[PDB]
Amino acid sequence: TTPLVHVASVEKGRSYEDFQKVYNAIALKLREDDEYDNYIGYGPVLVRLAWHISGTWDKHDNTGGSYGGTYRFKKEFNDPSNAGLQNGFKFLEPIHKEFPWISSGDLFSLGGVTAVQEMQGPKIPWRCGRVDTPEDTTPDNGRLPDADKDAGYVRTFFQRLNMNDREVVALMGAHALGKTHLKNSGYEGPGGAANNVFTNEFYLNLLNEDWKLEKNDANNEQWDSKSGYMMLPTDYSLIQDPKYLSIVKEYANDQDKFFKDFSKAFEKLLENGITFPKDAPSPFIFKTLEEQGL
Amino acid sequence: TTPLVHVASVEKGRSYEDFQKVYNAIALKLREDDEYDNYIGYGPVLVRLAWHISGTWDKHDNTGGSYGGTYRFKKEFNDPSNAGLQNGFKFLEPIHKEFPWISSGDLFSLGGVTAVQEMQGPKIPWRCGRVDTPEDTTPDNGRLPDADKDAGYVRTFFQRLNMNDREVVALMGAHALGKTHLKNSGYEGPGGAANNVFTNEFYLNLLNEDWKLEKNDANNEQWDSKSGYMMLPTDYSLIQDPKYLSIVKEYANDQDKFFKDFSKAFEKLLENGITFPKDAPSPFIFKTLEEQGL
Amino acid sequence: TEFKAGSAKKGATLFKTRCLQCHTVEKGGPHKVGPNLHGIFGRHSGQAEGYSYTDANIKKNVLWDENNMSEYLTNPKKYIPGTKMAFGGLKKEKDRNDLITYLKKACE
Amino acid sequence: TEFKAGSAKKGATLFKTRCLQCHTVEKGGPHKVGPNLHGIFGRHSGQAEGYSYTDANIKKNVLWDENNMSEYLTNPKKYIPGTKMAFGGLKKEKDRNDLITYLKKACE
Ligand code: HEC
Ligand code: HEC
Ligand code: HEC
Ligand code: HEC
Ligand SMILES: Cc1ccccc1N
Ligand SMILES: Cc1ccccc1N
């Protein structure tokens, strides 16, 4: 019967600035709810949200992926590796009530794109046409990676997402954003001083800072610097592996390259498993609230 | 060598979208600072400020008007009839430093335009090109109307502004907005229930409510209603005049006619004393924050 | 949920300054430009005895609860296009919540 | 004045969360990612040494007061293009007042 084929179908009657208005609604609520997570902002968790819903994709049978937008269910909401994402879902709930016509998938992904751009990151071209699957369909748990691993685990895991070394290290640059919460994952602390502003700091801190493998209050082992920062095992793997290392330094000295490659990879990630028709609209590039004079 | 001639010179390389940015910045700050004057917003005072700076015009010698932006200067600033307009400039100062290219006159009048539209009033076409002039040419104090006068005074006064019967009644619809402050003018109270939303309520209240001549705590006399509303004597004289009353009841049961007459009249007011070249672009129609989905 | 418990003390303040010149909270209170808000929860539209609603308000009857009240106050004309209620709108979610907590108390 | 006075207890709760990671305010404070801010008011930009400023910060050499600081913290890149400070900005006016008021105290 062949693996499933998820075809993009534009929300009927909707065009470029139908979505640009949704972009703005998110960018606005971002600036308003600035108090969240001790003034970190909803930005990071929205980026995380777009990743964890895109990370359910499996290239082998085309199951999962952002096309579904199945995040409204029970079985993938209570995942141990997913705790804390509900703050992102509740953030989006009012704007989905505002635009009932938009699909769950297109919202979660747009929300992640809106977060990265408004946090002074690169422009991420976005596309539409994600459609909502039956309640019957929902990706099994354990589709998302584990933070207590090595570089081999990361490389191997990301193969399932059709990602190569360069794409992986790029996407990882996002762990400059926000922090780890002990009540959520069993890890605690940020990876840098600027965690609500998209920067290449992740690679910089990974090289210049002095890391010591410690034990936090959840009995989990993480890498801590005496400047206060922290790194997941999987993140520290990037400087243990030699092939990963050279890319880390590349992004540490070259931020525009990192931006350019993150944009590609992130768009790819959000657009995995969805096959776009050829009459389908060219990818959207929304302008920031700063570009609209706000 | 014959009366002053003020030529509209467009700010270098600035087009529609530049001035739309200035509108947006102002329109956002109207929504952010919603606590001002017991939650009426900065809307009314900005409308007033634009009127007051362009109301300084004199058609005979072509002195004053909204052109020179001469209001930044001291003499006409500490004028008695100007109490309360301080808040109008404290409001616009941060916008001016964000867009330092725009002239004082363009900003002053744009604030008036922006306020009206954001308070859900008519679309007011706005032209650019005003340029600043030195304190050398600053209108002397006391060429703006007195509140304690009658219809004859009103009609006569507005002949100086080149406004006829139909026009002055429209412009006077703006006294639905905001309120009167005793510490400012010596009169106290609003003219209706909804004074931060642009409506024809002025004409309806003027006609329908029951008014009594009373003393206020400043010992000035004003027309009061038992609903807590008030009217300036000049406002009341709009029903004491036969031909003024003709227009009042006209706008009373028809809001659209008022809206279109107000727009044209307001635009003339802000543009009075200004000569526009053919080289000059057609006036802008700025879209609101709702229309931009902002 | 969408709304959640905020300050009923600041919601009163928001009612004093943005509603009280219109709306009356108390049971069987006087009328005004619009209706009397007593029993506005567990309530259709245009029920208020004695007030003349424009038919635009009662032409959509959906029971007022703590949620649909929130985005009616965000923009009264995006909810009921043709309502004669002239109001700027509560664009701040906090201001909405705090005012919703007060109106569920005074309009008991 | 342009900007009013705010809550220094609110400003201190704005510094711990949005500034303290890059900045120290107390006298003889250790130089972090950003320069020590003690006595920043009444001082030219890119002045306090021990820190390596980008030359864009020293480029326009401004005297720090209440009103010029406020817009620099609204959009650090718009006011000083090429600045090393990675900050989203204080888009809220009250948040600017509260913080500057606290900063005005701690810089003494
Ligand atoms: C006068 C200027 C008002 C202000 C300020 C507010 N409201 Fe109002 N309201 C007003 C009118 C004239 C009407 C009736 C509109 C119609 O078409 O008949 C209303 C109506 C409401 C309703 C709905 C009543 C119902 O459905 O039976 C609600 C829930 C309401 N108003 C609440 C409300 C609140 C909470 C306000 C301030 C925050 C507010 N209104 C402003 C007049 C005016
Ligand atoms: C790191 C992520 C920072 C955060 C968060 C904040 N600041 Fe900062 N600051 C930082 C750097 C790298 C620099 C130098 C800029 C350059 O171009 O080199 C600064 C500088 C300042 C200054 C000016 C110092 C001077 O003129 O001598 C000020 C007044 C300042 N920073 C204040 C400030 C405030 C109030 C912040 C939080 C609200 C804040 N900064 C955040 C690094 C970082
Ligand atoms: C492109 C984006 C992206 C990718 C890819 C990504 N993450 Fe993250 N992750 C985030 C963001 C953003 C946060 C912080 C969210 C927050 O602060 O709420 C985060 C935080 C976390 C947390 C802690 C969450 C919490 O609240 O404590 C864990 C655990 C984690 N990531 C594991 C991983 C692992 C393991 C991988 C891959 C091997 C991975 N992530 C890949 C974006 C990403
Ligand atoms: C097009 C707009 C406009 C015109 C024309 C206009 N006004 Fe007003 N005026 C306003 C607005 C809006 C307010 C309310 C300001 C506020 O609430 O801060 C106001 C307020 C006032 C006040 C009281 C200010 C205070 O703080 O107490 C006086 C007095 C006044 N106007 C006099 C006049 C007189 C006299 C005329 C003409 C004969 C006139 N105005 C024409 C817009 C206008
Ligand atoms: C290590 C890390 C730091 C900051 C935000 C996220 C992560 N994963
Ligand atoms: C009657 C009135 C109301 C509001 C503002 C001004 C006036 N004049």
UniProtKB/Swiss-Prot annotation, chains A, B:
Where found? Mitochondrion matrix; Mitochondrion intermembrane space
Its needed co-factors are: heme b
Keywords for the protein's UniProt record, in alphabetical order: Heme, Hydrogen peroxide, Iron, Metal-binding, Mitochondrion, Organic radical, Oxidoreductase, Peroxidase, Phosphoprotein, Transit peptide
A GO CC term attached to the entry? mitochondrial matrix
GO BP annotation list:
cellular response to oxidative stress; hydrogen peroxide catabolic process; response to reactive oxygen species
Q: Which GO terms describe its molecular function?
A: cytochrome-c peroxidase activity; heme binding; metal ion binding; peroxidase activity
Site positions (Transition state stabilizer) are R48
Q: What's its EC? A: 1.11.1.5
Q: Where does heme b bind?
A: H175
Q: What class of enzyme is it?
A: oxidoreductase
- Predominant localisation class: mitochondrion
Entry's cofactor comment: Binds 1 heme b (iron(II)-protoporphyrin IX) group per subunit.
* Location of the active site: H52 (proton acceptor), G191 (tryptophan radical intermediate)
Q: Which residues carry this modification: Phosphotyrosine?
A: Y153
Q: How is it modified after translation?
A: CCP1 precursor is processed by the rhomboid protease PCP1, which cleaves the N-terminal hydrophobic transit peptide. The m-AAA protease (composed of YTA12/RCA1 and YTA10/AFG3) is required for CCP1 maturation: m-AAA protease promotes membrane dislocation of the CCP1 transmembrane segment within the transit peptide to ensure the correct positioning of CCP1 within the membrane bilayer, allowing intramembrane cleavage by PCP1.
- Going by the entry's taxonomy, the superkingdom of the source organism is recorded as Eukaryota
Q: Which reaction does it catalyse?
A: 2 Fe(II)-[cytochrome c] + H2O2 + 2 H(+) = 2 Fe(III)-[cytochrome c] + 2 H2O
Give the transmembrane region(s): none
Indicate the family of this protein. Answer: Belongs to the peroxidase family. Cytochrome c peroxidase subfamily.
Quote the function comment for this protein. Answer: Destroys radicals which are normally produced within the cells and which are toxic to biological systems.
Self-association or partners: how does it assemble? Answer: Forms a one-to-one complex with cytochrome c.
Miscellaneous comment: Present with 6730 molecules/cell in log phase SD medium.
- UniProt protein name: Cytochrome c peroxidase, mitochondrial
Q: Which organism is it from?
A: Saccharomyces cerevisiae (strain ATCC 204508 / S288c)
Swiss-Prot record, chains C, D:
Q: Name one GO cellular component term.
A: mitochondrial intermembrane space
Q: Where is the signal peptide?
A: none
Q: What is its main location?
A: mitochondrion
**SUPFAM superfamilies listed in its UniProt record:** Cytochrome c (SSF46626)
Offer one example of a GO biological process linked to this entry. mitochondrial electron transport, cytochrome c to oxygen
**Which GO molecular function annotation, any one, does this entry have?**
electron transfer activity
Species of provenance: Saccharomyces cerevisiae (strain ATCC 204508 / S288c)
Name this protein carries in UniProt: Cytochrome c isoform 1
Family to which the UniProt record says this protein belongs: Belongs to the cytochrome c family.
Q: Which InterPro entries match?
A: Cyt_c-like_dom, Cyt_c-like_dom_sf, Cyt_c_1A/1B
> Per UniProt, what is the name of the gene that codes for the protein in this document?
CYC1
